[PDB]
Write a protein that binds this DNA or RNA. Structure first.
Lengths: 139, 119, 119
RNA sequence: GCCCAGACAGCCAGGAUGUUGGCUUAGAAGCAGCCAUCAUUUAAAGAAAGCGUAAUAGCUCACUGGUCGAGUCGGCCUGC
Protein backbone atom coordinates (compact mmCIF):
# COMPACT_ATOMS: atom_id res chain seq x y z
CA UNK A 1 0.00 0.00 0.00
CA UNK A 2 3.01 2.25 0.58
CA UNK A 3 4.80 1.14 -2.59
CA UNK A 4 3.89 3.46 -5.47
CA UNK A 5 5.59 4.84 -8.58
CA UNK A 6 4.34 7.50 -10.99
CA UNK A 7 5.30 8.53 -14.53
CA UNK A 8 4.02 8.26 -18.11
CA UNK A 9 4.16 10.19 -21.40
CA UNK A 10 2.79 10.54 -24.94
CA UNK A 11 1.98 7.16 -26.50
CA UNK A 12 0.79 6.84 -30.11
CA UNK A 13 -2.87 5.79 -30.01
CA UNK A 14 -2.50 2.16 -31.06
CA UNK A 15 1.17 1.37 -30.51
CA UNK A 16 2.48 -0.35 -27.37
CA UNK A 17 4.63 -3.49 -27.61
CA UNK A 18 7.13 -4.82 -28.19
CA UNK A 19 9.62 -4.17 -25.42
CA UNK A 20 11.36 -1.29 -27.13
CA UNK A 21 10.40 1.41 -26.60
CA UNK A 22 7.87 0.31 -23.96
CA UNK A 23 9.19 -2.82 -22.26
CA UNK A 24 11.26 -2.86 -19.03
CA UNK A 25 9.88 0.68 -18.73
CA UNK A 26 6.88 0.74 -16.40
CA UNK A 27 7.47 -2.99 -16.55
CA UNK A 28 10.00 -3.18 -13.73
CA UNK A 29 8.10 -0.75 -11.52
CA UNK A 30 5.31 -3.17 -10.65
CA UNK A 31 3.09 -3.17 -13.73
CA UNK A 32 3.56 -5.56 -16.66
CA UNK A 33 3.37 -4.71 -20.37
CA UNK A 34 1.29 -7.81 -21.15
CA UNK A 35 -2.09 -6.21 -20.57
CA UNK A 36 -2.23 -2.44 -20.03
CA UNK A 37 -1.60 -2.63 -23.79
CA UNK A 38 -5.11 -3.66 -24.81
CA UNK A 39 -6.04 -1.41 -21.90
CA UNK A 40 -4.87 1.63 -23.86
CA UNK A 41 -5.71 0.86 -27.48
CA UNK A 42 -9.24 -0.08 -26.41
CA UNK A 43 -10.14 3.22 -24.76
CA UNK A 44 -8.37 5.51 -27.20
CA UNK A 45 -10.64 4.32 -30.01
CA UNK A 46 -12.98 6.80 -31.75
CA UNK A 47 -10.41 9.59 -31.91
CA UNK A 48 -7.52 10.29 -34.29
CA UNK A 49 -5.29 7.26 -34.89
CA UNK A 50 -2.42 9.70 -35.33
CA UNK A 51 -2.67 11.44 -31.97
CA UNK A 52 0.26 11.07 -29.50
CA UNK A 53 -1.84 11.77 -26.40
CA UNK A 54 0.00 11.41 -23.05
CA UNK A 55 -2.21 9.33 -20.76
CA UNK A 56 -1.38 9.80 -17.07
CA UNK A 57 -0.71 6.46 -15.41
CA UNK A 58 0.23 5.68 -11.82
CA UNK A 59 1.65 2.23 -11.09
CA UNK A 60 0.49 -0.14 -8.35
CA UNK A 61 -0.02 -1.21 -4.75
CA UNK A 62 -0.83 -4.77 -5.77
CA UNK A 63 0.34 -5.57 -9.31
CA UNK A 64 -2.17 -3.79 -11.56
CA UNK A 65 -2.16 -0.26 -12.96
CA UNK A 66 -4.49 2.65 -13.81
CA UNK A 67 -5.55 4.84 -16.76
CA UNK A 68 -6.68 8.38 -17.63
CA UNK A 69 -6.65 9.67 -21.22
CA UNK A 70 -6.39 13.45 -20.97
CA UNK A 71 -6.32 15.94 -23.84
CA UNK A 72 -3.63 17.23 -28.27
CA UNK A 73 -5.21 19.36 -29.54
CA UNK A 74 -1.85 20.98 -28.70
CA UNK A 75 1.34 19.71 -30.39
CA UNK A 76 -0.77 18.22 -33.17
CA UNK A 77 -2.41 20.63 -35.62
CA UNK A 78 0.79 22.54 -34.84
CA UNK A 79 2.83 20.03 -36.83
CA UNK A 80 -0.16 19.46 -39.10
CA UNK A 81 -0.33 23.19 -39.80
CA UNK A 82 2.88 23.32 -41.81
CA UNK A 83 3.49 19.81 -43.12
CA UNK A 84 4.12 17.15 -40.49
CA UNK A 85 5.37 14.52 -42.94
CA UNK A 86 7.76 16.66 -44.99
CA UNK A 87 9.81 18.94 -42.77
CA UNK A 88 12.97 21.01 -43.17
CA UNK A 89 16.22 19.40 -42.07
CA UNK A 90 17.44 22.82 -41.00
CA UNK A 91 14.51 25.03 -39.80
CA UNK A 92 15.16 28.80 -39.98
CA UNK A 93 16.73 28.51 -43.42
CA UNK A 94 13.53 27.80 -45.34
CA UNK A 95 9.80 27.36 -44.74
CA UNK A 96 7.30 24.50 -44.93
CA UNK A 97 3.87 26.01 -44.32
CA UNK A 98 1.99 29.12 -43.23
CA UNK A 99 -0.64 30.18 -40.69
CA UNK A 100 -2.92 33.20 -40.33
CA UNK A 101 -3.44 35.34 -37.23
CA UNK A 102 -6.81 33.67 -36.65
CA UNK A 103 -5.23 30.21 -36.57
CA UNK A 104 -2.72 31.66 -34.11
CA UNK A 105 -5.27 32.37 -31.39
CA UNK A 106 -6.94 29.10 -32.40
CA UNK A 107 -4.24 26.68 -31.23
CA UNK A 108 -4.17 29.22 -28.41
CA UNK A 109 -6.70 29.13 -25.56
CA UNK A 110 -7.26 25.50 -26.60
CA UNK A 111 -4.43 24.45 -24.28
CA UNK A 112 -4.50 27.21 -21.67
CA UNK A 113 -5.04 24.32 -19.25
CA UNK A 114 -1.41 23.15 -19.53
CA UNK A 115 0.06 26.16 -21.28
CA UNK A 116 0.76 28.75 -18.62
CA UNK A 117 0.22 32.50 -18.88
CA UNK A 118 -2.05 35.45 -18.10
CA UNK A 119 -3.66 37.59 -20.81
CA UNK A 120 -4.36 36.17 -24.27
CA UNK A 121 -1.57 38.25 -25.79
CA UNK A 122 0.83 36.37 -23.52
CA UNK A 123 -0.73 33.16 -24.83
CA UNK A 124 -0.57 34.27 -28.46
CA UNK A 125 3.14 34.49 -27.77
CA UNK A 126 5.29 31.66 -26.36
CA UNK A 127 3.43 29.66 -28.99
CA UNK A 128 5.12 32.28 -31.15
CA UNK A 129 8.25 31.36 -29.24
CA UNK A 130 7.35 27.81 -30.11
CA UNK A 131 6.40 29.54 -33.36
CA UNK A 132 8.97 27.85 -35.52
CA UNK A 133 12.26 26.05 -35.20
CA UNK A 134 10.57 23.69 -37.62
CA UNK A 135 10.02 25.48 -40.94
CA UNK A 136 6.67 27.32 -40.90
CA UNK A 137 6.71 31.11 -41.22
CA UNK A 138 5.33 33.50 -38.59
CA UNK A 139 3.06 35.36 -41.01
CA UNK B 1 -20.86 48.05 25.03
CA UNK B 2 -18.77 50.89 26.48
CA UNK B 3 -17.28 53.19 23.84
CA UNK B 4 -13.84 52.64 25.36
CA UNK B 5 -14.49 48.89 25.20
CA UNK B 6 -15.42 49.20 21.53
CA UNK B 7 -12.20 51.10 20.82
CA UNK B 8 -10.14 48.35 22.44
CA UNK B 9 -12.12 45.66 20.60
CA UNK B 10 -11.31 47.27 17.25
CA UNK B 11 -7.62 47.42 18.17
CA UNK B 12 -7.66 43.67 18.78
CA UNK B 13 -9.58 42.83 15.61
CA UNK B 14 -7.28 41.94 12.72
CA UNK B 15 -7.43 44.47 9.90
CA UNK B 16 -9.42 41.80 8.07
CA UNK B 17 -11.98 41.94 10.86
CA UNK B 18 -12.22 45.72 10.49
CA UNK B 19 -12.33 45.99 6.68
CA UNK B 20 -15.47 43.97 6.10
CA UNK B 21 -16.66 45.89 9.17
CA UNK B 22 -16.45 49.35 7.61
CA UNK B 23 -17.90 48.03 4.36
CA UNK B 24 -20.60 46.53 6.54
CA UNK B 25 -21.54 49.87 8.10
CA UNK B 26 -21.48 51.18 4.53
CA UNK B 27 -24.42 48.96 3.54
CA UNK B 28 -26.75 50.24 6.26
CA UNK B 29 -25.86 53.79 7.28
CA UNK B 30 -24.38 54.28 3.83
CA UNK B 31 -21.06 55.54 2.48
CA UNK B 32 -21.94 58.90 4.04
CA UNK B 33 -22.81 57.91 7.61
CA UNK B 34 -20.41 54.95 7.62
CA UNK B 35 -17.62 57.24 6.42
CA UNK B 36 -16.85 58.11 10.04
CA UNK B 37 -15.88 54.57 11.04
CA UNK B 38 -14.38 53.84 7.61
CA UNK B 39 -11.83 56.66 7.86
CA UNK B 40 -11.10 55.94 11.53
CA UNK B 41 -10.82 52.16 11.13
CA UNK B 42 -8.36 52.23 8.24
CA UNK B 43 -5.60 53.74 10.46
CA UNK B 44 -5.01 50.26 11.92
CA UNK B 45 -1.35 51.00 11.14
CA UNK B 46 -1.11 47.67 9.32
CA UNK B 47 0.57 49.61 6.53
CA UNK B 48 2.21 52.26 8.71
CA UNK B 49 3.99 49.47 10.61
CA UNK B 50 5.31 47.45 7.66
CA UNK B 51 4.02 44.33 9.40
CA UNK B 52 2.04 40.64 12.17
CA UNK B 53 -0.83 36.82 8.12
CA UNK B 54 1.39 36.30 5.08
CA UNK B 55 4.04 33.97 3.66
CA UNK B 56 7.28 35.91 3.22
CA UNK B 57 9.91 34.25 1.03
CA UNK B 58 13.22 35.11 2.73
CA UNK B 59 14.92 32.43 0.62
CA UNK B 60 13.58 29.70 -1.66
CA UNK B 61 16.23 27.29 -2.91
CA UNK B 62 18.65 27.65 -5.83
CA UNK B 63 16.04 26.26 -8.25
CA UNK B 64 12.82 27.98 -9.32
CA UNK B 65 10.40 25.25 -10.28
CA UNK B 66 10.04 23.59 -6.86
CA UNK B 67 9.50 27.00 -5.28
CA UNK B 68 7.58 28.47 -8.20
CA UNK B 69 5.62 25.23 -8.60
CA UNK B 70 4.26 25.74 -5.09
CA UNK B 71 3.78 29.40 -5.97
CA UNK B 72 2.05 28.48 -9.23
CA UNK B 73 -0.11 26.00 -7.36
CA UNK B 74 -0.90 28.44 -4.56
CA UNK B 75 -1.33 31.52 -6.75
CA UNK B 76 -1.81 30.20 -10.28
CA UNK B 77 0.73 31.64 -12.72
CA UNK B 78 2.20 30.81 -16.17
CA UNK B 79 5.80 31.79 -17.22
CA UNK B 80 6.12 35.67 -16.18
CA UNK B 81 3.66 35.87 -13.03
CA UNK B 82 5.89 33.73 -10.50
CA UNK B 83 9.24 34.20 -12.65
CA UNK B 84 9.85 38.07 -12.19
CA UNK B 85 8.90 38.62 -8.41
CA UNK B 86 9.06 35.27 -6.49
CA UNK B 87 12.84 35.53 -6.61
CA UNK B 88 13.66 38.91 -5.10
CA UNK B 89 10.83 37.05 -3.48
CA UNK B 90 8.12 39.74 -3.22
CA UNK B 91 7.14 37.65 -0.23
CA UNK B 92 3.52 38.47 -1.02
CA UNK B 93 3.17 34.85 -2.13
CA UNK B 94 -0.37 35.17 -0.82
CA UNK B 95 -2.36 37.66 1.26
CA UNK B 96 -5.19 37.70 3.78
CA UNK B 97 -4.54 34.17 5.01
CA UNK B 98 -5.13 32.82 8.52
CA UNK B 99 -2.34 31.63 10.81
CA UNK B 100 -2.96 28.00 9.87
CA UNK B 101 -3.18 28.63 6.12
CA UNK B 102 -0.10 30.84 6.26
CA UNK B 103 1.57 28.09 8.28
CA UNK B 104 0.53 25.45 5.74
CA UNK B 105 1.73 27.59 2.84
CA UNK B 106 5.07 28.08 4.59
CA UNK B 107 5.38 24.31 4.95
CA UNK B 108 4.73 23.61 1.27
CA UNK B 109 7.34 26.20 0.33
CA UNK B 110 9.84 24.93 2.89
CA UNK B 111 9.31 21.46 1.43
CA UNK B 112 10.37 22.91 -1.91
CA UNK B 113 13.17 24.35 0.19
CA UNK B 114 11.97 27.92 0.59
CA UNK B 115 13.16 29.75 3.70
CA UNK B 116 9.89 31.47 4.57
CA UNK B 117 9.08 33.86 7.42
CA UNK B 118 5.47 34.38 8.50
CA UNK B 119 4.55 37.94 9.43
CA UNK C 1 23.27 47.39 12.18
CA UNK C 2 22.36 43.81 13.12
CA UNK C 3 20.42 41.92 10.44
CA UNK C 4 17.73 41.11 13.01
CA UNK C 5 17.67 44.79 13.94
CA UNK C 6 17.22 45.69 10.28
CA UNK C 7 14.33 43.24 9.96
CA UNK C 8 12.61 44.83 12.95
CA UNK C 9 13.49 48.31 11.70
CA UNK C 10 11.88 47.51 8.35
CA UNK C 11 8.83 46.12 10.15
CA UNK C 12 8.42 49.57 11.71
CA UNK C 13 8.50 52.00 8.78
CA UNK C 14 5.38 53.20 6.95
CA UNK C 15 4.29 52.40 3.38
CA UNK C 16 5.86 55.62 2.14
CA UNK C 17 9.16 54.88 3.89
CA UNK C 18 9.74 51.41 2.43
CA UNK C 19 8.85 52.61 -1.07
CA UNK C 20 11.60 55.17 -0.54
CA UNK C 21 14.03 52.48 0.58
CA UNK C 22 13.30 49.98 -2.19
CA UNK C 23 13.55 52.83 -4.69
CA UNK C 24 16.86 54.05 -3.28
CA UNK C 25 18.17 50.48 -3.44
CA UNK C 26 17.02 50.21 -7.05
CA UNK C 27 18.92 53.37 -8.01
CA UNK C 28 22.04 52.22 -6.16
CA UNK C 29 22.08 48.44 -6.67
CA UNK C 30 19.75 48.02 -9.63
CA UNK C 31 16.54 46.26 -10.68
CA UNK C 32 18.57 43.04 -10.57
CA UNK C 33 20.58 43.53 -7.38
CA UNK C 34 18.21 45.81 -5.47
CA UNK C 35 15.61 43.18 -6.32
CA UNK C 36 16.51 41.25 -3.16
CA UNK C 37 15.11 44.17 -1.14
CA UNK C 38 12.15 45.49 -3.13
CA UNK C 39 10.79 42.17 -1.88
CA UNK C 40 10.81 41.82 1.91
CA UNK C 41 9.25 45.26 1.61
CA UNK C 42 6.06 44.78 -0.42
CA UNK C 43 4.54 42.17 1.99
CA UNK C 44 4.03 44.97 4.51
CA UNK C 45 0.47 43.64 4.78
CA UNK C 46 -1.14 46.96 3.86
CA UNK C 47 -3.41 45.08 1.48
CA UNK C 48 -2.85 41.63 2.98
CA UNK C 49 -4.67 42.85 6.07
CA UNK C 50 -6.72 45.14 3.84
CA UNK C 51 -10.39 44.04 -0.86
CA UNK C 52 -13.07 38.12 1.27
CA UNK C 53 -17.36 37.46 4.16
CA UNK C 54 -19.03 36.68 7.49
CA UNK C 55 -21.54 38.64 9.58
CA UNK C 56 -20.84 39.32 13.27
CA UNK C 57 -22.97 41.10 15.85
CA UNK C 58 -21.15 43.77 17.86
CA UNK C 59 -24.26 44.69 19.84
CA UNK C 60 -28.04 44.32 19.65
CA UNK C 61 -28.75 47.58 21.44
CA UNK C 62 -32.07 48.10 23.20
CA UNK C 63 -34.00 46.25 20.49
CA UNK C 64 -32.90 42.73 21.41
CA UNK C 65 -36.22 41.25 20.28
CA UNK C 66 -36.00 43.15 16.98
CA UNK C 67 -32.46 41.93 16.33
CA UNK C 68 -33.48 38.38 17.22
CA UNK C 69 -36.28 38.56 14.64
CA UNK C 70 -33.79 39.37 11.87
CA UNK C 71 -31.49 36.59 13.07
CA UNK C 72 -34.34 34.07 13.19
CA UNK C 73 -35.21 35.05 9.63
CA UNK C 74 -31.69 34.88 8.20
CA UNK C 75 -30.35 31.85 10.08
CA UNK C 76 -33.70 30.19 10.71
CA UNK C 77 -32.68 29.26 14.25
CA UNK C 78 -35.31 28.80 16.93
CA UNK C 79 -36.20 31.41 19.54
CA UNK C 80 -33.90 29.95 22.19
CA UNK C 81 -31.03 29.45 19.72
CA UNK C 82 -31.46 32.95 18.29
CA UNK C 83 -31.57 34.87 21.57
CA UNK C 84 -28.54 32.89 22.72
CA UNK C 85 -26.64 34.07 19.65
CA UNK C 86 -27.77 37.67 20.18
CA UNK C 87 -27.32 38.17 23.93
CA UNK C 88 -23.70 37.13 24.45
CA UNK C 89 -23.23 38.33 20.87
CA UNK C 90 -21.24 35.20 19.83
CA UNK C 91 -20.38 37.15 16.67
CA UNK C 92 -20.73 34.85 13.65
CA UNK C 93 -24.31 35.36 12.48
CA UNK C 94 -23.50 33.52 9.25
CA UNK C 95 -20.33 32.97 7.23
CA UNK C 96 -19.35 31.73 3.79
CA UNK C 97 -21.50 34.37 2.10
CA UNK C 98 -20.31 36.75 -0.64
CA UNK C 99 -19.66 40.48 -0.30
CA UNK C 100 -23.12 41.58 -1.42
CA UNK C 101 -24.80 38.92 0.73
CA UNK C 102 -22.77 39.57 3.88
CA UNK C 103 -23.34 43.21 2.99
CA UNK C 104 -27.12 43.04 2.59
CA UNK C 105 -27.34 40.71 5.59
CA UNK C 106 -26.26 43.53 7.90
CA UNK C 107 -28.72 45.72 6.01
CA UNK C 108 -31.29 43.69 7.93
CA UNK C 109 -29.65 43.73 11.36
CA UNK C 110 -28.79 47.36 12.10
CA UNK C 111 -32.29 48.32 10.98
CA UNK C 112 -33.46 46.35 14.00
CA UNK C 113 -31.13 48.59 15.97
CA UNK C 114 -28.03 46.42 16.19
CA UNK C 115 -24.37 47.25 15.61
CA UNK C 116 -22.90 44.60 13.30
CA UNK C 117 -19.37 43.73 12.16
CA UNK C 118 -18.15 41.59 9.27
CA UNK C 119 -14.72 39.90 9.32
C1' G D 1 41.91 44.42 -13.13
C1' C D 2 39.14 42.62 -9.07
C1' C D 3 38.62 43.56 -2.81
C1' C D 4 34.90 44.24 3.69
C1' A D 5 27.08 45.59 -1.10
C1' G D 6 31.59 38.38 2.86
C1' A D 7 32.20 37.03 -2.82
C1' C D 8 35.01 32.29 -4.77
C1' A D 9 34.89 27.10 -2.92
C1' G D 10 31.86 23.65 1.43
C1' C D 11 26.70 22.02 3.77
C1' C D 12 20.92 22.46 3.30
C1' A D 13 17.24 22.76 -0.29
C1' G D 14 16.37 23.28 -4.51
C1' G D 15 17.89 22.29 -11.62
C1' A D 16 11.66 23.74 -14.22
C1' U D 17 6.77 25.01 -18.24
C1' G D 18 5.22 24.76 -23.74
C1' U D 19 8.51 20.29 -24.97
C1' U D 20 9.82 13.83 -25.64
C1' G D 21 11.95 21.69 -30.19
C1' G D 22 12.20 19.65 -34.97
C1' C D 23 14.09 16.36 -38.30
C1' U D 24 15.72 11.69 -38.36
C1' U D 25 15.50 7.06 -36.18
C1' A D 26 13.20 0.18 -34.69
C1' G D 27 13.74 3.82 -30.33
C1' A D 28 16.60 8.81 -29.31
C1' A D 29 12.16 12.09 -24.80
C1' G D 30 18.81 18.08 -22.62
C1' C D 31 22.76 14.08 -23.38
C1' A D 32 23.57 8.62 -31.55
C1' G D 33 23.37 12.02 -35.54
C1' C D 34 21.32 16.39 -38.47
C1' C D 35 19.45 21.82 -37.41
C1' A D 36 18.21 25.49 -34.77
C1' U D 37 18.62 26.99 -29.40
C1' C D 38 13.09 30.82 -28.86
C1' A D 39 9.40 31.99 -25.10
C1' U D 40 6.37 31.74 -21.60
C1' U D 41 6.59 31.38 -14.37
C1' U D 42 11.28 34.00 -10.63
C1' A D 43 16.73 35.83 -6.25
C1' A D 44 18.21 31.54 -10.38
C1' A D 45 17.35 26.65 -14.51
C1' G D 46 21.68 26.28 -20.83
C1' A D 47 15.27 23.49 -25.12
C1' A D 48 20.97 21.71 -21.34
C1' A D 49 28.03 20.87 -19.52
C1' G D 50 28.71 15.08 -17.73
C1' C D 51 27.29 9.94 -15.56
C1' G D 52 23.24 6.82 -16.72
C1' U D 53 18.67 3.92 -19.94
C1' A D 54 17.21 -0.44 -25.22
C1' A D 55 14.49 4.29 -25.36
C1' U D 56 12.33 6.53 -20.28
C1' A D 57 13.65 7.01 -15.33
C1' G D 58 17.38 8.34 -11.86
C1' C D 59 21.91 11.20 -10.41
C1' U D 60 25.16 15.74 -10.87
C1' C D 61 26.70 20.71 -13.30
C1' A D 62 25.65 25.51 -15.07
C1' C D 63 22.35 29.63 -12.56
C1' U D 64 20.76 31.81 -7.99
C1' G D 65 19.48 32.06 -1.62
C1' G D 66 20.46 30.44 3.13
C1' U D 67 24.16 29.03 6.07
C1' C D 68 30.03 28.69 6.33
C1' G D 69 33.65 33.63 6.29
C1' A D 70 39.12 37.57 3.69
C1' G D 71 42.08 39.47 -0.13
C1' U D 72 41.62 37.30 -4.63
C1' C D 73 42.16 36.70 -9.78
C1' G D 74 44.20 37.43 -14.96
C1' G D 75 48.80 38.80 -17.11
C1' C D 76 54.14 40.61 -18.34
C1' C D 77 59.43 40.28 -16.89
C1' U D 78 63.84 38.82 -14.34
C1' G D 79 67.65 35.89 -10.89
C1' C D 80 69.06 31.03 -9.32
Amino acid sequence: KKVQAYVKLQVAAGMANPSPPVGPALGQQGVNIMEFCKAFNAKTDSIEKGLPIPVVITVYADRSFTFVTKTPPAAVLLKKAAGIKSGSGKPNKDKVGKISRAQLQEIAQTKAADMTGADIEAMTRSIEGTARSMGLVVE
Amino acid sequence: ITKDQIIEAVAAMSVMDVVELISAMEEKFGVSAAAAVAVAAGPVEAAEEKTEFDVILKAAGANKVAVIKAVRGATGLGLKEAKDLVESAPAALKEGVSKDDAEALKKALEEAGAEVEVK
